[PDB]
Design a protein around this nucleic acid. Structure first.
Lengths: 79, 127, 204, 101, 148
RNA sequence: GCAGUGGGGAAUAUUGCACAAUGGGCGCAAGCCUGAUGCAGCCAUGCCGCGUGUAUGAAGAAGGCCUUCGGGUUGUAAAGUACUUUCGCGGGGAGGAAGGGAGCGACGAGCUCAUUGACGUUACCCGCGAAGUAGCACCGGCUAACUCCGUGCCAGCAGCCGCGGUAAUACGGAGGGUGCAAGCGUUAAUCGGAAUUACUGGGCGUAAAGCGCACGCAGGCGGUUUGUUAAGUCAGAUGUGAAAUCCC
RNA sequence: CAAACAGGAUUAGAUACCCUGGUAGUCCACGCCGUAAACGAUGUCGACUUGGAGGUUGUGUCUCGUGGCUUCCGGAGCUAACG
């Protein structure tokens, strides 16, 4: 699966957390609600920096918290 | 504005109340598409693109003794809460007398026109 | 069933229901045309609920059926298509005990119910002893070959001669048989009932 | 009744008499009962006469006595120690009275 | 000819300098059954006097309901005072489903089938007024066409 | 654990019959094991079916009741006549179940033939055949169904409004009547009406209801034209959406 | 000037009203609180819907037109009624 998000942190090495956000209708009201999730994606090349809107795909579990890897960078920067 | 379609609709509702010959409303393809059904259905004489520099839609309203051609007209689908109806969901305004304009992939059409084509969409408003 | 003085029910309902000697000048409704009791004289005061109640009452009393099945049959006829009122009588008129009565095998519905229970009546050959049996069109209702001798049916069928039968029916006094042509419409039936009133009562 | 139970047993604490309210006047027979529910409420004693002592122990039905504010329950006669009314030729269903020969 | 239906009658009492003077009110519905309706509500010191006076008033104010196959031309929602009445055409076999107030007015109206319901105030006097008003606003495609 | 005992509670059962049938474990098989299950018992706890009779029978018994005592009412209702004849008795007596073995064939495939059953001697069929239990609740209004007597704010009734202090259809009895019927009532518990949280369906100056004001974070929302993407949204196809249930 | 309070009166009693005194307080500086029929008891912005009359302020071809502000009367309409 592919997920789009922002690089909210590049503190760790080879590890970048992507803040993916989505919009879903409320099961009762139906009005769209905002929901986000942080995913620790792998980045061996430490190519992606903070502010980068990258794509994320499911991959072989690098660690317990990391099960995703950086595929491609959408845009350059957006702080 | 926030909901141009509602504005236009209101500007005609308030214009007819004062029995004005014509009324202006900021142009927009969607608006024109709507005005098209209003003229064909017989709610308005017609319309015309006006404006020296700013595109407007001069709506020529018409009236009759006793009742006004457009007795009622209100937007049911608003930006705050959009509404969508299926082919069988299309409600009949005043058992046929009145009609409703829906926006489908086939284009803007009335209940009967949409019912015939066999498709549903966003219920723009009721007249 | 009810089982008791039927000649009193006729007075209460106001109309003359055919329970037995309704033909004779005895039927109390001929002597005193007022409901039973020490108050059948004083002027009665009926309400909207009263007219609907007494209405279905006489209806059910005619066929002499319980209030349960009567209600059950009502629900059914109300489910199927077509005017409920019409269908109603159709079902009740479909009862075996009722058919037998219409055919003349029995003096009354009560006696007809007995004949059925006594296995003295057959349907398309096989015998049926259930008064609640629903007779469909094209079904032949004749007397039992063994019962063909009992004086009771002998006298009943004898009086049947020359007597006309309903359009939805057709009997053969000779063979002592009967056939259910079709479901009787409200036009065929001449009951002192106002189907429009009985349907309102159950509305509630 | 606590456990939403139709009835509830209990032991009488005292079988005294009470006087109706403003509009009525009499010596209605009541009795404080310590139900198994853990509550000590007052119940009315229907009938013209009863045989409830201190260790009566009777079942409670539940019913408010308009005249006696506080009495929200009625004692079931014909059960436990509460003997059914004597010579009750009428509504024997209540007061628990066997039909005489 | 015209058939009358007694909707409802009220005792109606009032305090006056001298005591209580009773006056009975009565709602009557006059109709032939082929499209004409008539509502009447007159008072009188005597019940029958009010009933008759009512029938006379009912026949004086009649409406020509444009019936179509035992039904109406289109749904309507008339709102009299705090009372509200809604009407909706229906296929045959449905029957006149509505309160005693509206039905009685619809039966004589000639209506054979219709779906209705009472909203807001349930006042019998205000609902009958709302019903008749709704029967007036009723229009047919012929009228609308010739109207436009 | 099954049945059962004692204790608890308003209250819930035979320490019964049986493996042949179906299914299961082991065995090549024969066969062994199997209170799994198939049944019977107890209890109107519920549901459905049936019976306590059918036809006849006085301008109209007796008795009770009412009376302007003229009479009226309970009534064709009972008695009585005729007919059928649930129980009970006699006889017959069920479906629910083939192989192992033996003969032919190479004791293989295949074919052929023989022996054996709980509930039951019950269901059901035939014959005989006696009229052969009914009760409970309610009758002021909502609720359909009335009088007389007793009592007398006393005794008592009561879901709410109330009723009773000497004429009470709401107290008790009786006659009568209504409802239902081996059932009938009572008590407890669940549902909507409530558009009284109102998404469909609501309100806030005085009936309950704008926070005292400002600034401002997050969040929510956002003007006109064009292009790309197209995540939301919409469309086609396909996979999934167990059985049963519900609907026809 | 005036709670509390000191006395004199009134009264059935007056630990009120009336009359004579009178402390805190009321006044100033600094510190404290956060409430109120903090009421038009109806928050801000934009668009739309007859006019008449009085007033403050700018402009205009100024016995009148036009923009902003402050009142009153009122079309349609709104409100249970008042408005």
């Amino acid at each position: 699966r592919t997920l789009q998000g922002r690089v909210v942190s590049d503190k760790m090495e080879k590890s970048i957390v992507v803040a993916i956000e989505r919009f879903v209708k409320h099961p009762i009201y139906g009005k769209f609600i905002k929901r986000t999730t942080k995913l620790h994606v792998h980045d061996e090349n430490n190519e992606c920096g903070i502010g980068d809107v990258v794509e994320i795909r499911e991959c072989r579990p690098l660690s317990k918290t990391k099960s995703w890897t950086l595929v491609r960078v959408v845009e350059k920067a957006v702080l | 504005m926030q909901d141009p379609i509602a504005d236009m609709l209101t500007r005609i509702r308030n214009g007819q109340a004062a029995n004005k010959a014509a009324v202006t409303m900021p142009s927009s393809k969607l608006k024109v598409a709507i005005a098209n059904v209003l003229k064909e259905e017989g709610f308005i004489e017609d319309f015309k693109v006006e404006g020296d520099t700013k595109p407007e839609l001069e709506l020529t309203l018409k009236y009759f003794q006793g009742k006004a051609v457009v007795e009622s007209i209100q937007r049911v689908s608003r930006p705050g809460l959009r509404i969508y109806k299926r082919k069988d969901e299309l409600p009949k305004v005043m058992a046929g007398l009145g009609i409703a304009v829906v926006s489908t992939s086939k284009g803007v059409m009335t209940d009967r026109a949409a019912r015939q084509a066999g498709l549903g969409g966003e219920i723009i408003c009721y007249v | 069933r009810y089982l008791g003085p039927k000649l009193k029910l006729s007075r209460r309902e106001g109309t003359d229901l055919f329970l037995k000697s309704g033909v004779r000048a005895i039927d109390t409704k001929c002597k005193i045309e007022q409901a039973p009791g020490q108050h059948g004289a004083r002027k009665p005061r009926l309400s909207d609920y009263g007219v609907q109640l007494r209405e279905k009452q006489k209806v059910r009393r005619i066929y002499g059926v319980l209030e349960r099945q009567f209600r059950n049959y009502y629900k059914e006829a109300a489910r199927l298509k077509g005017n409920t009122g019409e269908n109603l009588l159709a079902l009740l008129e479909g009862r075996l005990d009722n058919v037998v009565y219409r055919m003349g095998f029995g003096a009354t519905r009560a006696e007809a119910r007995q004949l059925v229970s006594h296995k003295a009546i057959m349907v398309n050959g096989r015998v049926v002893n259930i008064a609640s049996y629903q007779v469909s069109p094209n079904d032949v209702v004749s007397i039992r070959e063994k019962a063909k001798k009992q004086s009771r049916v002998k006298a009943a069928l004898e009086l049947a001669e020359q007597r006309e039968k309903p359009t939805w029916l057709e009997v053969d006094a000779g063979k002592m048989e009967g056939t259910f042509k079709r479901k009787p419409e409200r036009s065929d039936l001449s009951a002192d009932i106002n189907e429009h009133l009985i349907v309102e009562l159950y509305s509630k | 009744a606590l456990e939403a139970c139709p009835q509830k047993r209990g032991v009488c604490t005292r079988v005294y008499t009470t006087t109706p309210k403003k509009p009525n006047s009499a010596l209605r027979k009541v009795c404080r009962v310590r139900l198994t529910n853990g509550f000590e409420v007052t119940s009315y004693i229907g009938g013209e006469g009863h045989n409830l002592q201190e260790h009566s122990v009777i079942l409670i039905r539940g019913g408010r006595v308009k005249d006696l504010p506080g009495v929200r329950y009625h004692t079931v006669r014909g059960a436990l120690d509460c003997s059914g009314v004597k010579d009750r030729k009428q509504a024997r269903s209540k007061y628990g009275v066997k039909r005489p020969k | 000819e015209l058939q009358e239906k007694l909707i409802a009658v009220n005792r109606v009492s009032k305090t006056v300098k001298g005591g209580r003077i009773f006056s009975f009110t009565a709602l009557t519905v006059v109709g032939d059954g082929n499209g004409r309706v008539g509502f009447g509500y007159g008072k009188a010191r005597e019940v029958p006097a009010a009933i008759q006076k009512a029938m006379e008033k009912a026949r004086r104010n009649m409406i020509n309901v444009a019936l179509n196959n035992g039904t109406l031309q289109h749904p309507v929602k008339g709102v009299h005072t705090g009372s509200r009445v809604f009407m909706q055409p229906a296929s045959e076999g449905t029957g006149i489903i509505a309160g005693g107030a509206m039905r009685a007015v619809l039966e004589v109206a000639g209506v054979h089938n219709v779906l209705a319901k009472a909203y807001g105030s349930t006042n019998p006097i205000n609902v009958v007024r709302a019903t008749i008003d709704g029967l007036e606003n009723m229009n047919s495609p012929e009228m609308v066409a010739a109207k436009r």
